[PDB]
Subunit: 206 residues, 3 copies
């Protein structure tokens, strides 16, 4: 078995910065967003199911998914969102499980943007939340995208609140910094996680 | 952005008594029930457009989402009080910055509901059986306000809470 | 109104051993899996509805449900599973409520294997988790069924983690050993649950 530490945070919290810091210590990172992309790659069962359901025009000349087309085709039929999700849900679960089993690091870091929203913390052994102020989320996202404060605040309104995330966190790491202290903070967490992972299979009492 | 304090409680907890005390202090109250009705009003978009309930959900949820969001942006108070009867049941606390639970004994829930709605004790117990439990609400509460007594007895707690919420609302966006 | 103490635990935690210990102390045990069986017993309208929907072969010559036959008809088939849940979920809810209402013990022990997975703890006044190490879950499951360690890890991955259960538990009882080892803990919990049951209806403050 593999010890699973789930990492989550809101838009603009810099989850990648924290994940890369754990990757630097030899931890394998399994990213929910990458897995979702991997399950619709050429050859994947989901791709054929998608073409069969939405039609051949969802497939590009090279056989890959026309994501933009499908993305806009869903918006034009939210009911379709459900069929798609019901299709991909099982596949993402199986591919995620596969990649976790394949990781050889002491424990794995599973990055899940929607950890709180979809209650996926129930599938984690430990929950780490990358925390930052709402201003930081707004600032960074804008500087990385567009439409000033609006648009983004529309995103923050659609995600779980800062407080909702802290409510389910076992550990919290601040990323308002530079990250001047992320390397240090990550090192401390790593030490604890190595300990938790080496004893979790046989530990008789919590 | 606007700070959201969610208010919830079981049937007979007197949620309105508490919400009106905040309303009197100048806080805009956004009522989930009021909004649910507004979404299905005369000439509403929803009207123009087992099982069938789910189809009806994919329709009413987004609209309810947008309307709630609209009332929150037009509110003029430092923070808003979002009254959500099914906060625990529907996990809507994940959308709140703070959770206030109006708490009472099951005895109070029974006595008040039977009185106000003139119904049997076995009838209200059925309702209590269908809503989250007292302890389930307490598990997600940031703040708890006892409402077992008369309306005037909550004054002290409302004043402490309102001052705390004003402070949280003023600092939350930049709070490191 | 009866006080409801929900009991849960992962596969191999020996949930029924704990439940039986409380039953021996005079507590009415309300088991979700037993309730599901009761609602499809001979004479129940749900049984006839199942035969009408899936076929007469769903019923045995002695009038009882052919359990594996039904499972085979819903396995893989999402629509048939949905249909069966739509039929049974309400009946199970009603029967459970009914048996809780008629129980004679001050508090009941509601045994729910999927308590955390399905957020059913929201309907309990107290949550008792039967806790065991993952190692215990693996060994017991491997001995019970003719399965491999990996087969069991797949099951474990489909259930909430040990930590997720502990996060919502009010009380925890260790069941890594033999049945007698829990007698003392069950007696202590029992005494406390009678106290909570005696005060909960009129308790003014939490």
């Amino acid at each position: 078995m593999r010890y699973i530490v789930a990492l989550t945070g809101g838009i603009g919290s810099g989850k990648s910065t924290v994940a890369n810091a754990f990757a630097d210590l030899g931890i394998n990172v399994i990213d929910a967003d990458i897995i979702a992309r991997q399950v619709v790659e050429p050859g994947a069962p989901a791709l054929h199911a998608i073409a069969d359901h939405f039609g051949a025009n969802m497939i590009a000349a090279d056989g890959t998914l026309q994501r933009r087309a499908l993305r806009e085709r869903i918006f034009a039929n939210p009911e379709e969102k459900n069929w798609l999700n019901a299709l991909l849900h099982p596949l993402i679960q199986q591919e995620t499980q596969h990649q976790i089993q394949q990781a050889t690091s002491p424990y794995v870091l599973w990055v899940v943007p929607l950890l709180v929203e979809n209650s996926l913390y129930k599938k984690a052994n430990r929950v780490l939340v990358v925390d930052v102020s709402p201003e930081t989320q707004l600032k960074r996202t804008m500087q990385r995208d567009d439409v000033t404060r609006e648009h983004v605040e529309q995103i923050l309104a659609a995600q779980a609140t800062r407080e909702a995330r802290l409510a389910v966190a076992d550990d919290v790491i601040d990323n308002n910094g530079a990250p001047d202290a992320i390397a240090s903070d990550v090192a401390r967490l790593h030490a604890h996680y190595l300990q938790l992972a080496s004893q979790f299979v046989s530990q008789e009492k919590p």
